[PDB]
Amino acid sequence: KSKLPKPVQDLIKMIFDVESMKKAMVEYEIDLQKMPLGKLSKRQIQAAYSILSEVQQAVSQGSDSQILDLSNRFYTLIPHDFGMKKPPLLNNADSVQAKAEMLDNLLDIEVAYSLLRGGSDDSSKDPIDVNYEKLKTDIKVVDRDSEEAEIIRKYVKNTHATTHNAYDLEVIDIFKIEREGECQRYKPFKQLHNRRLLWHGSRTTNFAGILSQGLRIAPPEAPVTGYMFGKGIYFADMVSKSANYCHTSQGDPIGLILLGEVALGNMYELKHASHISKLPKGKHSVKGLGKTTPDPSANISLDGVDVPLGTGISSGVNDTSLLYNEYIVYDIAQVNLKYLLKLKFNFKT
Ligand SMILES: C[C@@H]1CN(C(=O)c2cc(Cn3c(=O)[nH]c(=O)c4ccccc43)ccc2F)CCN1CC(F)(F)F
Known part of the structure; x- marks a missing residue:
C-alpha cells in the first residue's frame, strides 16, 4: 500500500x-x-x-x-x-x-x-x-510554513508577467528533489560566481525522463537552427514564462515546473537569435536579454544561491527580441535541480 x-x-x-x-x-x-x-x-x-x-x-x-x-x-x-x-x-x-x-x-x-x-x-x-x-531521485514534501516555502511562493507570486495574465497560478505542492549523483556532477561549479535559482517548465510527460536522466541537451543530430540560442538547457527568471511551456489547458490544468541551481558565471549577453555550437572563450552561459527583468535590488539568497524574485521592471535594453530574460547553459553539469512544484492553472478565458 x-x-x-x-x-x-x-x-x-x-x-x-x-x-x-x-x-x-x-x-x-x-x-x-x-x-x-x-x-x-x-x-x-x-x-x-x-x-x-x-x-x-x-x-x-x-x-x-x-x-x-x-x-x-x-x-x-x-x-x-x-x-x-x-x-x-x-x-x-x-x-x-x-x-x-x-x-x-x-x-x-x-x-x-x-x-x-x-x-x-x-x-x-x-x-x-x-x-x-x-x-533515482529523493523526493520530499516541503512544509508549507518553512522558510524555503515562503521564498518559493514569493518567487511565484512576484514574477508572473502582465503579458501572461490569461491564467493565474496556484502552488499545490512544493517538493525538494535530489537526483542521484547530481551533487557530485555539480561539484566543479558549486562555488562559481553568478549561481542563480531559475525556472524550467516542461510538460508533465517529460518529467520521468528529466528526473531519471537530468535536464539534457538536444543531441548532435538535432538542427541547431531549431533552438534560438543553440542546443543548451534553457531557464527563465519569470515563473509565467516557464509556466507557458507546461502546455496546460482548461481540460488539463495541472502542471509541473522545476527550480534549478544554475551556474551561469560569466554570461554572454545576446539580444537576438544566435545558433551557436559553443560559447566564446571565458563565457560559462548565455543570457538572452529581456526588455523586462526582476528588480535587482529585491534579490534574496536561499542556501547561498541568488533568487531573483523582484517584481518586473524595465531592464533598459532597447532592440531585443525578448520580452523577458532567458538563461542557457551548454554543459549539463552546470545544473543542480533543487525543487519541483505542482501548479494549478486557473484560466480566466
Ligand atoms: C529540456 C531539454 C533541454 N531543452 C531546453 O532547455 C529548451 C527549452 C526550450 C523551451 N523552454 C522550455 O521548455 N521551458 C522553459 O522554462 C524555458 C525557459 C526559457 C526559454 C525556453 C524554455 C527551448 C529550447 C531548449 F533547448 C530542449 C529539450 N530537452 C533536450 C532533450 F534532448 F532532452 F530533448
Whole structure:
C-alpha cells in the first residue's frame, strides 16, 4: 500500500501516466496506429533529427520541388496522422523548430516508457514505490510554513508577467528533489560566481525522463537552427514564462515546473537569435536579454544561491527580441535541480 506521502504518490502517478504520453504524441500530430508508444525508439528519433537537419540545410540555401523529397523522408521515419493525406510541406524555419520540439518530447517520453517496460514485476509491491525507485531521485514534501516555502511562493507570486495574465497560478505542492549523483556532477561549479535559482517548465510527460536522466541537451543530430540560442538547457527568471511551456489547458490544468541551481558565471549577453555550437572563450552561459527583468535590488539568497524574485521592471535594453530574460547553459553539469512544484492553472478565458 506504499508509505510515501500522498503528494509524492500523486506526482508519480502523474509523470508515469501512459495515457498522458499518448495524448502528448497526438498533440504533436503523430499517428499512434503506425507509431505507437511501444514502437518508439532512440535510433528512430535520432534518425528523424538527422532528416530534420537535412531540411534545415535546404531551407538555409533556398525550391518546393527539391524540399518535397526531404519533407516526405521525415514523415517516413515519424508517421503523422493524415489518413490518405498528402501531408503539409516542411519548408521553413518554423517547421524545423516545431518538429524539433516534437522530437525533444519524444526523447523524454521514450525514456519514461522504457523505465516502465524494463525492470521487474512483483504484485506484492505497490507500483507507486516501484516506479518511484526508477527515478533515482529523493523526493520530499516541503512544509508549507518553512522558510524555503515562503521564498518559493514569493518567487511565484512576484514574477508572473502582465503579458501572461490569461491564467493565474496556484502552488499545490512544493517538493525538494535530489537526483542521484547530481551533487557530485555539480561539484566543479558549486562555488562559481553568478549561481542563480531559475525556472524550467516542461510538460508533465517529460518529467520521468528529466528526473531519471537530468535536464539534457538536444543531441548532435538535432538542427541547431531549431533552438534560438543553440542546443543548451534553457531557464527563465519569470515563473509565467516557464509556466507557458507546461502546455496546460482548461481540460488539463495541472502542471509541473522545476527550480534549478544554475551556474551561469560569466554570461554572454545576446539580444537576438544566435545558433551557436559553443560559447566564446571565458563565457560559462548565455543570457538572452529581456526588455523586462526582476528588480535587482529585491534579490534574496536561499542556501547561498541568488533568487531573483523582484517584481518586473524595465531592464533598459532597447532592440531585443525578448520580452523577458532567458538563461542557457551548454554543459549539463552546470545544473543542480533543487525543487519541483505542482501548479494549478486557473484560466480566466
Ligand atoms: C529540456 C531539454 C533541454 N531543452 C531546453 O532547455 C529548451 C527549452 C526550450 C523551451 N523552454 C522550455 O521548455 N521551458 C522553459 O522554462 C524555458 C525557459 C526559457 C526559454 C525556453 C524554455 C527551448 C529550447 C531548449 F533547448 C530542449 C529539450 N530537452 C533536450 C532533450 F534532448 F532532452 F530533448
